[PDB]
Symmetry: D2
Subunit: 317 residues, 4 copies
């Protein structure tokens, strides 16, 4: 039987005997993602070029407005906003949402794949809503995932029931369920990181990557891929297996990627798919944040690959 | 004034006092590219999944093949998808030879990586009965070439003698809008692009050049690395941002990996028309005289100062 | 604040403390309607004409399959099917749906507006579901409405809370709420019927139309409009006011339109909009059907216009 | 073999050994029509209703056609239903063609989602004078091309030229007009009549008598069916596809009719005649009227020839 994201979300909410608030949140996010996709694919660009005589900001506006009007949220943290956004009293629900509305858009001028990343938390205290409600470890996530605006548009949604992938059919604006309860390969054959900054690598990263290129045994060297857009690289890791790295170094002891709306959602998807996600020192999902924009190192993907990295990392610890 | 690809192609044909045959070819190709984009973005996939109770690379080849055949402008067609050249039936023959990759990068379409269509257009040069040999011309001889990138948005890059022009597909109206005119690549970039998984097989010249990008001998900032693994995506980035793209020979691909006729030559033509460079290491890509329609070539291309720097390192290793 | 069909249907179900079954029904119908619209606008027609080297049937298949897979229905009545469809036991819910999947499609060859009409009943009994469960008067409707595939695509949905109109934004495949709690004009200035049957008209119809052309109170004559597609003509009646008539004639002595999936849903929309719908002898919604494809005469629209027709009708007994 | 509007127009221009100017005109119009279709179907309406936290369609449509035709470099004089005076194209963009068009016909009733359309007629400038409004004052029989786009259940472009009438369906998945009906001809006699019978009290006696013959046939035949969408493009297209007759005649209150000669009557009359149909004012062929004002009105009775001819017999019977 055919299944849509709308039908899937609703049925999961009915199974859980929810009140319907999270379902409305998720319906609203889905509508925003379709609107971002339409804009990313440049529908209407002819009018900008005068036929009748901003993208990251627009994407942030779509998600903010759709989530606010769901009546399901109370605190919203965006890559694009300096402070947490507090929902007006009359529209407050119980959920906290952290999101990157257009990840990878810094290089959107070359039409590289971009994406939307989100993580949904339940507000934990009855206090007046504030940034502190967003300072939860990723292990508290209720749902998380991403939309990839690639060759096609796909929404990957992870919850307690596992990871499910929905393809956007732009003819009818419906996300069609195409991959159910997806699991990552135990060991991959691809490594992904920016090797241009090798002179800054921690010695452990240098040694691990050298082992991927010059394997000590009779195995084939891994292939390399680095799109430079986190959603594209993490999605490829999910589909094909392997390892994605944005690790710490001495000039960046906490990494570069942001914990709340990049690392934690992707770490959550990975673990629900049977993968792993580490800072080197601990699981990404166990980090307790103190700053809504704080950075975290991240190494994620197939467990045998992540564990091999940790073996090398501890050798230099 | 707004300009569409349709209007742009027609006016170039008018200025050249052509008979309209090449205009019909390019209009047919534009229609095929829009149909491929729609399919690549999965329009109608719900029907495939049972909403009412071909492979993408094969469909794309069928779209390009049929639109070019029915243009009456072509006589010989070479596709990545076909072992032998397709010879157009006599009554539909025109004078052009088209080599193309209808869905470049589609081997990894399962992870929704950017894919593209690459094409190069030659005039038939021989007066013989049309055959596979008519596609064996050096890239030197191209009349027009370019690619469609099905990335975050769909763009067509078209190169001819008048230069390189970039058109964005507006999917609301199915129209290619001219958005970047007479494009030129940066003289020198800050990004290098290659699969470093083959580091163990690199010739010394490639190894040293990449070492220079990571550890600059002059203490400037290291280049950033990018490698999508889809040639159209990596080359388009090289065009837009500058830098260098490399697919050199390795042990699995001793003649290189990329295909000369419908990957290297079109991209090399776009690059040179944009003020860039494209070399095999030994010679300009466009000077290679092919002997086989699916033959491979090593390729190093992008900003002129970056390729020239590579070539100096190459000469240092004889 | 923006509102979608998805969000509106979900919120009405929450206010009603429903189990979510009707919501799944309506979302499934929403998906089918977008797919029908896509096909009606001829998306993909180039593939039929050889670019790479039935509509009424497809429309029925879309509605049938989406409703079956909702797990919300037990009996399905379509204009396209001789007998009622009984849903298999594992997919049964409690709702009975009568629909015309592509109303007006007989003239789709001239690109006239066409539509989808639907009416939803609740099955209350523990008997095994059968065709007889669809033999209900329209006053039993839980929800009803129509999708119009006209110059744009609009879904009109009627329930106890009133009538609401949703515009399909095809860039994102989302129905946008654009007209809330719609009420029809008390009196219009347009009458709609096929005057080609003037020779067969009952004396009451003839006299009523004479009053529209030569007004007894010295008012200006009504304008005439007859698209010949029931959904187009009735939607215009809703938006602009006035009257729509399909009375008995010699080829159709019980009228021509179908009671179950044409007259009843439109009569329901009209009454929920403050309008009226009569057979001449009684309200459409009070007719007790004996055959799922039985026909009925219908006069519907603005209340003053229908009441005026009924005055003429009562004059002729 | 599949054929698109772009390819068909280009090949017709090649067959005629044209310079390509008319081809550029038509490509530009095709682009405008796709943009109108997109807006008519309400793409992006979610943004107007606040999804991220403005012109009426008839104005946008006029702006689209005006700008696309200007930038074709193929036109010199433009007449629109929306503009009191003809637009004279600035010198650097001038071509030889005169275009009269209605950018969104029937749009006054667009609020009920009734079918709407675009109508156009293309002339060559005949005078050696500086271009002016007078260059649009040509009889319809001078038309080089004419036709219409109907934004109905699907969007179709009907294009008439000397080679006949051809119908192209817009495939919105790819923005291509697909040739679906070639060298169209209308039925010799139909079974539908189309006019606003609510104003029967104002009818001319000939019209009254003719419509009476359709409802109460004297020859024991079946009465005609009635259809009246109230959008000219929709009613005329149905007349082309199914046959029959469409009427907006002159009456006692409107001695010149209501529809506009230059950009409503002439193009539809031209399409009709190229399809083997007829189009008359009652007194003469629409295509023979020589206009004196670009917004002048004309009565129109058009469609299947046996029906128009029957109408004219009744009309002449009443002198
Ligand atoms: C395990 C999953 C996340 C449960 C789901 S899945 C969905 N659509 N809704 C819920 C849910 C539970 C409670 C509530 P609520 O009372 O806050 O709405 O919703
Ligand atoms: C420099 C460019 C390639 C010239 C162009 S650009 C276009 N649309 N057509 C032509 C062209 C020249 C000759 C012919 P033809 O007589 O084969 O048709 O066409
Ligand atoms: C008055 C309106 C129609 C009530 C609505 S509105 C909506 N979306 N659902 C319902 C509803 C009631 C009962 C059930 P259920 O337990 O069969 O699902 O649903
Ligand atoms: C009979 C038809 C109208 C001929 C056609 S059909 C088309 N696409 N162009 C032309 C045409 C003739 C002259 C010119 P021009 O030199 O003004 O461009 O064009």
């Amino acid at each position: 039987d055919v299944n849509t994201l709308t039908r899937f979300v609703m049925e999961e909410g009915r199974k859980a005997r929810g009140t319907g608030e999270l379902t409305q949140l998720l319906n609203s996010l889905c509508t925003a993602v379709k609107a971002i996709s339409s804009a990313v694919r440049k529908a209407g660009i002819a009018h900008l070029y005068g036929i009748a005589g901003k993208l990251d900001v627009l994407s942030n506006d779509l998600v903010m407005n759709m989530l606010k009007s769901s009546f399901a949220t109370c605190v919203l943290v965006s890559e694009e906003d300096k402070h947490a956004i507090i929902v007006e009293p009359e529209k407050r629900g119980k959920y906290v949402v952290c999101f990157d509305p257009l990840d990878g858009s810094s290089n959107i001028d070359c039409l590289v794949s971009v994406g939307t990343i989100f993580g949904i938390y339940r507000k934990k205290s009855t206090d007046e809503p504030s940034e502190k409600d967003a300072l939860q470890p990723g292990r508290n996530l209720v749902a998380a995932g991403y939309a990839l605006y690639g060759s096609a548009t796909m929404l990957v949604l992870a919850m307690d029931c596992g990871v499910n992938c929905f393809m956007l059919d732009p003819a009818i604006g419906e996300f069609i369920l195409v991959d159910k309860d997806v699991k990552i390969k135990k060991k991959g054959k691809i490594y992904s990181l920016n090797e241009g900054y090798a002179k800054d690598f921690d010695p452990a990263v240098t040694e691990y990557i050298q082992r991927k290129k010059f394997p000590p045994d009779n195995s084939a060297p891994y292939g390399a891929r680095y799109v430079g857009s986190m959603v594209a690289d993490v999605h490829r890791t999910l589909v094909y297996g392997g390892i994605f790295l944005y690790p710490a170094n001495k000039k960046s002891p906490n990494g570069k990627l942001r914990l709340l709306y990049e690392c934690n959602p992707m770490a959550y998807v990975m673990e629900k798919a049977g993968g792993m996600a580490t800072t080197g020192k601990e699981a990404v999902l166990d980090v307790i944040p103190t700053d809504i924009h704080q950075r975290a190192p991240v190494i994620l993907g197939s467990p045998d690959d992540v564990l091999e990295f940790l073996k090398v990392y501890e050798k230099h610890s």
